Design a protein around this ligand. Structure first.
Ligand code: CL
Ligand code: MG
Ligand code: MG
Ligand code: MG
Ligand code: MG
Ligand code: MN
Length: 234
Protein backbone atom coordinates (compact mmCIF):
# COMPACT_ATOMS: atom_id res chain seq x y z
CA UNK A 1 0.00 0.00 0.00
CA UNK A 2 0.76 3.67 -0.46
CA UNK A 3 2.05 6.32 1.91
CA UNK A 4 -0.12 9.29 2.79
CA UNK A 5 2.32 11.65 1.08
CA UNK A 6 3.73 10.30 -2.19
CA UNK A 7 5.88 13.29 -2.95
CA UNK A 8 6.08 17.03 -2.69
CA UNK A 9 7.79 19.86 -4.52
CA UNK A 10 8.35 23.57 -4.07
CA UNK A 11 9.26 26.53 -6.24
CA UNK A 12 9.66 30.21 -5.65
CA UNK A 13 10.07 33.03 -8.15
CA UNK A 14 10.97 36.63 -7.32
CA UNK A 15 9.59 37.85 -10.63
CA UNK A 16 10.85 40.82 -12.64
CA UNK A 17 9.10 43.57 -10.67
CA UNK A 18 9.68 43.13 -6.96
CA UNK A 19 13.08 44.09 -5.62
CA UNK A 20 13.10 41.30 -3.07
CA UNK A 21 11.60 37.82 -2.80
CA UNK A 22 9.80 38.19 0.51
CA UNK A 23 8.03 34.83 0.20
CA UNK A 24 9.35 31.73 1.95
CA UNK A 25 8.35 28.07 1.90
CA UNK A 26 8.86 24.90 3.90
CA UNK A 27 8.47 21.21 2.96
CA UNK A 28 9.63 18.83 5.69
CA UNK A 29 8.19 15.52 6.68
CA UNK A 30 4.41 16.01 6.95
CA UNK A 31 4.70 19.81 7.39
CA UNK A 32 4.34 22.17 4.44
CA UNK A 33 4.01 25.93 4.48
CA UNK A 34 4.16 29.20 2.60
CA UNK A 35 4.76 32.60 4.18
CA UNK A 36 4.35 35.79 2.16
CA UNK A 37 6.17 38.64 3.84
CA UNK A 38 5.35 42.29 3.45
CA UNK A 39 6.94 45.58 4.37
CA UNK A 40 10.53 46.76 4.47
CA UNK A 41 11.52 43.68 6.43
CA UNK A 42 9.00 41.26 4.95
CA UNK A 43 11.80 38.83 4.03
CA UNK A 44 12.86 38.69 7.62
CA UNK A 45 9.25 38.14 8.72
CA UNK A 46 8.52 35.17 6.42
CA UNK A 47 11.91 33.48 6.94
CA UNK A 48 11.75 33.85 10.70
CA UNK A 49 8.16 32.63 10.83
CA UNK A 50 9.05 29.42 9.00
CA UNK A 51 12.22 28.79 11.00
CA UNK A 52 10.26 29.13 14.21
CA UNK A 53 7.35 27.09 12.87
CA UNK A 54 9.65 24.25 11.83
CA UNK A 55 11.37 24.12 15.23
CA UNK A 56 8.17 24.29 17.17
CA UNK A 57 6.46 21.57 15.15
CA UNK A 58 9.49 19.33 15.49
CA UNK A 59 9.31 19.74 19.24
CA UNK A 60 5.61 18.85 19.32
CA UNK A 61 4.32 17.35 16.06
CA UNK A 62 0.60 17.22 16.77
CA UNK A 63 -2.31 19.63 16.27
CA UNK A 64 -1.79 21.54 19.49
CA UNK A 65 1.93 21.69 18.82
CA UNK A 66 1.38 23.12 15.40
CA UNK A 67 -0.92 25.76 16.79
CA UNK A 68 1.65 26.54 19.51
CA UNK A 69 4.37 26.81 16.86
CA UNK A 70 2.29 29.33 14.93
CA UNK A 71 1.82 31.34 18.12
CA UNK A 72 5.55 31.22 18.78
CA UNK A 73 6.29 32.28 15.21
CA UNK A 74 3.98 35.28 15.68
CA UNK A 75 5.62 36.30 18.92
CA UNK A 76 9.16 35.91 17.61
CA UNK A 77 8.48 37.97 14.49
CA UNK A 78 6.71 40.64 16.53
CA UNK A 79 9.57 40.78 19.05
CA UNK A 80 12.05 41.25 16.23
CA UNK A 81 10.19 43.63 13.95
CA UNK A 82 7.55 45.36 16.08
CA UNK A 83 9.69 48.38 16.93
CA UNK A 84 10.37 49.30 13.32
CA UNK A 85 9.02 52.62 12.08
CA UNK A 86 6.74 50.92 9.61
CA UNK A 87 4.93 47.66 9.83
CA UNK A 88 6.40 44.43 8.39
CA UNK A 89 4.85 41.01 8.84
CA UNK A 90 3.86 37.91 6.94
CA UNK A 91 1.11 35.60 5.93
CA UNK A 92 1.39 31.98 6.91
CA UNK A 93 -0.40 28.92 5.59
CA UNK A 94 0.76 25.63 7.08
CA UNK A 95 -0.44 22.12 6.30
CA UNK A 96 0.29 19.11 8.43
CA UNK A 97 -0.58 15.85 6.69
CA UNK A 98 -1.46 14.02 9.90
CA UNK A 99 -2.69 10.47 9.94
CA UNK A 100 -6.28 9.86 11.12
CA UNK A 101 -5.04 9.01 14.59
CA UNK A 102 -3.77 12.58 14.92
CA UNK A 103 -7.02 14.00 13.56
CA UNK A 104 -6.20 13.87 9.88
CA UNK A 105 -4.74 16.56 7.59
CA UNK A 106 -4.92 20.06 9.02
CA UNK A 107 -4.49 23.61 7.71
CA UNK A 108 -3.62 26.61 9.83
CA UNK A 109 -3.72 29.90 7.98
CA UNK A 110 -3.45 33.63 8.45
CA UNK A 111 -3.46 36.11 5.61
CA UNK A 112 -3.98 35.38 1.92
CA UNK A 113 -1.63 32.58 0.81
CA UNK A 114 -4.23 29.99 -0.14
CA UNK A 115 -4.50 26.27 0.14
CA UNK A 116 -6.10 24.55 -2.85
CA UNK A 117 -7.20 20.99 -3.49
CA UNK A 118 -6.78 19.57 -6.96
CA UNK A 119 -9.16 16.68 -7.53
CA UNK A 120 -10.41 15.16 -10.80
CA UNK A 121 -9.07 18.14 -12.78
CA UNK A 122 -10.63 20.83 -10.60
CA UNK A 123 -8.75 23.28 -8.48
CA UNK A 124 -10.62 24.87 -5.57
CA UNK A 125 -9.52 27.13 -2.79
CA UNK A 126 -10.13 25.72 0.67
CA UNK A 127 -9.05 28.61 2.85
CA UNK A 128 -10.45 32.08 3.35
CA UNK A 129 -8.28 35.06 2.54
CA UNK A 130 -7.91 37.54 5.39
CA UNK A 131 -7.93 40.59 3.16
CA UNK A 132 -10.49 43.24 2.39
CA UNK A 133 -11.49 41.31 -0.74
CA UNK A 134 -11.33 37.97 0.96
CA UNK A 135 -13.62 39.15 3.78
CA UNK A 136 -16.14 40.08 1.11
CA UNK A 137 -15.97 36.49 -0.15
CA UNK A 138 -16.44 35.21 3.47
CA UNK A 139 -19.49 37.56 3.80
CA UNK A 140 -20.86 36.08 0.59
CA UNK A 141 -20.82 39.42 -1.21
CA UNK A 142 -18.37 38.70 -4.15
CA UNK A 143 -16.93 35.62 -5.78
CA UNK A 144 -13.36 34.41 -5.41
CA UNK A 145 -12.77 35.33 -9.06
CA UNK A 146 -14.06 38.84 -8.44
CA UNK A 147 -11.79 39.11 -5.41
CA UNK A 148 -8.73 38.69 -7.76
CA UNK A 149 -9.54 42.09 -9.28
CA UNK A 150 -10.85 43.89 -6.23
CA UNK A 151 -9.00 47.12 -5.69
CA UNK A 152 -8.28 46.41 -2.05
CA UNK A 153 -7.20 42.78 -2.54
CA UNK A 154 -3.78 43.73 -1.33
CA UNK A 155 -4.83 44.91 2.14
CA UNK A 156 -4.61 42.23 4.79
CA UNK A 157 -7.00 41.94 7.71
CA UNK A 158 -4.87 39.41 9.62
CA UNK A 159 -1.12 38.88 9.60
CA UNK A 160 1.61 37.23 11.58
CA UNK A 161 4.22 39.20 13.39
CA UNK A 162 2.36 42.55 13.73
CA UNK A 163 1.18 42.22 17.32
CA UNK A 164 1.36 39.83 20.22
CA UNK A 165 -1.88 38.00 19.49
CA UNK A 166 -3.19 36.22 16.47
CA UNK A 167 -6.15 34.08 15.70
CA UNK A 168 -5.36 31.89 12.72
CA UNK A 169 -8.02 29.82 11.02
CA UNK A 170 -7.63 26.11 11.83
CA UNK A 171 -9.52 23.34 10.07
CA UNK A 172 -9.30 19.83 8.75
CA UNK A 173 -8.55 19.32 5.09
CA UNK A 174 -11.01 17.05 3.30
CA UNK A 175 -8.61 15.09 1.09
CA UNK A 176 -7.56 11.59 0.29
CA UNK A 177 -5.60 9.34 -2.00
CA UNK A 178 -5.03 10.79 -5.45
CA UNK A 179 -5.67 14.35 -4.43
CA UNK A 180 -3.08 17.04 -4.84
CA UNK A 181 -2.73 19.93 -2.40
CA UNK A 182 -1.25 23.28 -3.42
CA UNK A 183 -0.19 26.02 -1.09
CA UNK A 184 0.59 29.29 -2.89
CA UNK A 185 1.38 32.87 -2.20
CA UNK A 186 -1.02 35.37 -3.76
CA UNK A 187 1.43 35.99 -6.59
CA UNK A 188 0.14 32.97 -8.49
CA UNK A 189 -3.32 34.46 -9.11
CA UNK A 190 -2.17 38.05 -9.65
CA UNK A 191 -2.76 37.99 -13.40
CA UNK A 192 -2.62 34.73 -15.27
CA UNK A 193 -5.44 32.93 -16.95
CA UNK A 194 -7.07 30.55 -14.51
CA UNK A 195 -7.18 27.74 -17.04
CA UNK A 196 -3.47 27.94 -17.55
CA UNK A 197 -2.87 27.98 -13.79
CA UNK A 198 -4.95 24.81 -13.55
CA UNK A 199 -3.09 23.26 -16.51
CA UNK A 200 0.20 23.89 -14.68
CA UNK A 201 -1.18 22.75 -11.31
CA UNK A 202 -2.33 19.41 -12.77
CA UNK A 203 1.00 18.56 -14.36
CA UNK A 204 1.53 14.89 -13.40
CA UNK A 205 5.05 15.33 -12.05
CA UNK A 206 4.89 17.69 -9.04
CA UNK A 207 8.38 19.03 -9.78
CA UNK A 208 7.15 19.99 -13.24
CA UNK A 209 3.95 21.41 -11.74
CA UNK A 210 5.78 23.82 -9.45
CA UNK A 211 8.08 25.04 -12.22
CA UNK A 212 5.15 25.50 -14.60
CA UNK A 213 3.17 27.36 -11.95
CA UNK A 214 5.81 29.98 -11.37
CA UNK A 215 6.40 30.22 -15.15
CA UNK A 216 2.71 30.88 -15.71
CA UNK A 217 2.77 33.65 -13.13
CA UNK A 218 6.01 35.12 -14.53
CA UNK A 219 4.82 35.02 -18.11
CA UNK A 220 1.67 36.89 -17.05
CA UNK A 221 3.81 39.74 -15.78
CA UNK A 222 5.34 38.49 -12.56
CA UNK A 223 4.02 41.51 -10.63
CA UNK A 224 4.57 39.71 -7.33
CA UNK A 225 6.71 37.00 -5.89
CA UNK A 226 5.13 33.58 -6.49
CA UNK A 227 5.79 30.58 -4.28
CA UNK A 228 4.13 27.20 -4.54
CA UNK A 229 4.22 23.95 -2.58
CA UNK A 230 2.61 20.85 -4.16
CA UNK A 231 1.82 17.71 -2.17
CA UNK A 232 0.64 14.48 -3.84
CA UNK A 233 -1.44 12.27 -1.56
CA UNK A 234 -1.72 8.46 -1.47
CL1 CL B 1 11.94 37.40 -13.76
MG1 MG C 1 14.77 42.28 -10.67
MG1 MG D 1 5.00 39.67 -0.01
MG1 MG E 1 -0.39 40.27 -0.88
MG1 MG F 1 -1.90 40.00 -4.80
MN1 MN G 1 2.35 38.37 -2.32
Amino acid sequence: GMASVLSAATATDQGPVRENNQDACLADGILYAVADGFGARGHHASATALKTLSAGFAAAPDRDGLLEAVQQANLRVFELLGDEPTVSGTTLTAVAVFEPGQGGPLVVNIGDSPLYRIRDGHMEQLTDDHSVAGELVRMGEITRHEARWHPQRHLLTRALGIGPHIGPDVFGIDCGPGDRLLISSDGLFAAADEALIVDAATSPDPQVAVRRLVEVANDAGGSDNTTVVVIDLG
